[PDB]
Amino acid sequence: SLTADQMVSALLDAEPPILYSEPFSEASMMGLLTNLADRELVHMINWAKRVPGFVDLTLHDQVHLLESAWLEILMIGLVWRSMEHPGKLLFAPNLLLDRNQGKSVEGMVEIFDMLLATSSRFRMMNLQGEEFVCLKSIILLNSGDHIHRVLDKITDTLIHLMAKAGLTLQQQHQRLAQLLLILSHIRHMSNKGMEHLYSMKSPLSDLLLEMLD
Amino acid sequence: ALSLTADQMVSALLDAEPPILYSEYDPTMMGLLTNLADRELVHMINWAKRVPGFVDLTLHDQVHLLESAWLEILMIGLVWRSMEHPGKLLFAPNLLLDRNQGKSVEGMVEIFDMLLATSSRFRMMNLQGEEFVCLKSIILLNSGVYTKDHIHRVLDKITDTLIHLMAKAGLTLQQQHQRLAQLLLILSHIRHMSNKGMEHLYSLSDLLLEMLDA
Ligand SMILES: CC/C(=C(\c1ccc(O)cc1)c1ccc(OCCN(C)C)cc1)c1ccccc1
Ligand SMILES: CC/C(=C(\c1ccc(O)cc1)c1ccc(OCCN(C)C)cc1)c1ccccc1
């Protein structure tokens, strides 16, 4: 219903805050991130409810979308924070880790490097905040009819941002392609992430349902 | 390679297309799929070498891109040929499985329904052959690009090719970048399905370098 520019403003206003973290072992480092993550998830839900077209979906669909996309969203949020910190990841203002410390957790050295590669790619493209919030909304809606019309609106919005940037048509859809292809790499990183979290001993849906309702 | 046109890009990719192989005739499942995939893999190497700008890369990079994308390439091919067979996957012309047949297969418990939905998606989008071969080429160059400027230059060109096909088809410019977005978002799902497959298979850098010595 809305215009390409008020879509930007609405999403920007719905942006979650940057939370603070609470040598490392494997269990203490994953304790830090899990905590930050679970705190971060509360704010993600409130953000999702303010993404245009989300609350119009059934509760069953809202939960399902967040359930499959939550790690993707945390990761692209992490990458966005670490953009101006080459060779490092900004989990929190009080938790900036280089590649060296990432070996505290086994199997995390691979995922770590994939996040750093994404961060450099965003810097190479000089990703804007107006585009970032658009990419993040797409992730929430795509990873899981009405949804596609909303997704089609975000595409127009992204194009609108690139057209106002002074870009000709060729560089516009080229950049659009470049951006969306990164999401495939983000999905990949999430998949490898779920594995590791599954490779651990023992409520998201409970948290999702509790806060969404 | 960077100086081709959209029509020359399409023409090169279409003639680079691998043949649809058959499952081994033996009247008297993962074994059949493994056998089929390994024979398909040999044709994939020949195809990849015909993808514009792929041979401009080093031998090491060619191996890396293929080891990262091979299952995605096989899966999108599976989805493509299963398009006009609703609610059923066409692994081979003589190996056609529907859902209940597929539910009883090793670890295809998750991806079968995903592959069908992807096939449903392409069908209701009316995916053209010219678009398909473009998407498959994109997969080849993009899957391992993060795990280099020439690669992104070829990708941008395949993007230019896709847009041209949509403009010629008679789509408005708004419909053009919308369709392009839809197609590329699907690649995320295909990446997702591949990961699910790789894991199950996990329970190479070698053989590729062997095949590309040709
Ligand atoms: C990439 C860092 C990370 C997590 C993370 C990323 C971004 C962010 O802002 C916060 C954390 C991470 C770690 C643990 C985690 O667990 C939450 C789920 N619990 C309830 C099991 C989630 C994300 C991670 C995820 C999986 C495996 C290893 C590490
Ligand atoms: C989706 C069907 C499939 C295979 C397949 C897909 C498309 C195609 O055209 C042909 C086959 C599949 C099955 C086995 C397989 O193994 C080859 C590698 N071997 C040496 C381990 C590859 C793909 C599969 C992949 C992973 C797990 C379970 C099934």
Numbering used by the authors:
A (entry chain B): 309 to 330, 336 to 457, 473 to 530, 535 to 545
B (entry chain A): 307 to 334, 342 to 460, 472 to 527, 536 to 546
What is the paper's account of this structure, in its own sentences?
The pro-oncogenic cellular activities of estrogen receptor alpha (ERα) drive breast cancer pathogenesis. Ligand-dependent transcriptional activities depend on the association of coactivator proteins with ERα to form functional complexes. SERMs and SERDs elicit a structural rearrangement of the ERα LBD to sterically preclude binding of coactivators in the activating function-2 cleft. Activating somatic mutations near ERα helix 12, Y537S and D538G, enable hormone therapy resistance in metastatic ER +breast cancers.
We solved x-ray crystal structures of antiestrogens in complex with Y537S and WT ERα ligand binding domain (LBD) to understand the structural basis of differential transcriptional antagonistic efficacies. Tamoxifen and other SERMs also antagonize transcription but induce a stable antagonist conformation that enhances ERα nuclear lifetime. Comparison of Y537S ERα LBD x-ray crystal structures in complex with SERMs and SERDs reveal a ligand-dependent H12 conformational pose that corresponds to increased transcriptional antagonistic efficacies. X-ray crystal structures of WT and Y537S ERα LBD in complex with SERMs, SERM/SERDs, and a SERD showed that the most efficacious molecules enforced H12 burial within the AF-2 cleft. Conversely, molecules with diminished Y537S transcriptional potencies poorly enforced this conformation as H12 showed variable conformations and reduced surface area burial in the AF-2 cleft. Reduced Y537S efficacy correlates with decreased H12 surface area burial in the AF-2 Cleft.
